[PDB]
Amino acid sequence: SNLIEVFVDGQSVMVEPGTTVLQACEKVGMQIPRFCYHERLSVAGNCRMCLVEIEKAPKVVAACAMPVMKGWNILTNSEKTKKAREGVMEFLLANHPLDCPICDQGGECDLQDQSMMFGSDRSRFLEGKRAVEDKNIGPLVKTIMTRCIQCTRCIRFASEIAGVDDLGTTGRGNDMQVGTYIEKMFMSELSGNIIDICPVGALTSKPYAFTARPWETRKTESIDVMDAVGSNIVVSTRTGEVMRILPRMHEDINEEWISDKTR
């Protein structure tokens, strides 16, 4: 009825009003690069990795936050779009630490994978890097905060999903730091989910630390039994040993979260 027509790379798609540019692209099977955006968190628009060109429009728009307009043609592979991604990736990697060999995220890192797919193949940053101090938020989540890319996913999850306003940002500019300011533990019954949403190895699982790499684990799709909710999980095993538990998306049960006891 009220569907409006937009185009993705010239292909017409009908979407409801209020659909974002990022959502319009999904309907034709394209995934826009992202870091700060998460479909179950409030829109942020800060990482700028989703910038995309609208045809015959001088400025690129943040695909995650921009509602589509009737007749828009979204050029998701244009030279302007591709050069926006390369610039943003370059800024993300400027201060990032050369940690991949010792970082648990290695092999299942969105920063690694989107650098490979959408970024340049080399560096022209000739300066020294930022280094941030680490923060203790309890025994379940390890924080190597020099890896943080300031996407604020953890802050939005802590506030909106767990209902806890303990995480935030302090300072500003290049020195803006995610944390609790004071020495405080983040020990919600849902706290372990900030490990999953964090796109980098800034927040990692303390119990899982260093034990395995992603490519070598076999994934068994199973069901949690720590409660009567029936959360869908993936058991990760390696060489006949259970290594970790991850959530498995089920919209009508656990969405994509699990409790700390399950995890």
């Binding site: 974002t20 959502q23 409030s42 995650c64 969105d110 940002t169 068994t220």
Partner: protein, 87 residues
């Protein structure tokens, strides 16, 4: 967040015993199908392959994420709870 590994259908078999090699402690197996994974374009293709090979199978419906209503302006609501306390 990438969704490119959720595009195709897979066929895998039931997991069987893995035990520790006495010499080195490696994980030993007597199951020839432990690593056998097959890719299919559609559910029908996978079922047809299992029927003609005689294997008992369980099929599971594809889980597609629900469409969400996203609104950046909801972060600044005049009177709703969606108003955020930090950016």
């Amino acid at each position: 967040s990438g969704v490119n590994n959720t595009k195709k259908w897979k066929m895998e078999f039931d997991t069987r015993e893995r035990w520790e090699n006495p010499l080195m402690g490696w994980a030993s197996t007597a199951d020839p199908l432990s690593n056998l994974v097959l890719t299919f374009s559609t559910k029908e293709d996978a079922v047809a392959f299992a029927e003609k090979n005689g294997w008992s199978y369980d099929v599971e419906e594809r889980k597609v994420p629900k469409p969400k209503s996203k609104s950046y302006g909801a972060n600044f609501s005049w009177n709703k709870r969606t108003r955020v306390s930090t950016k």
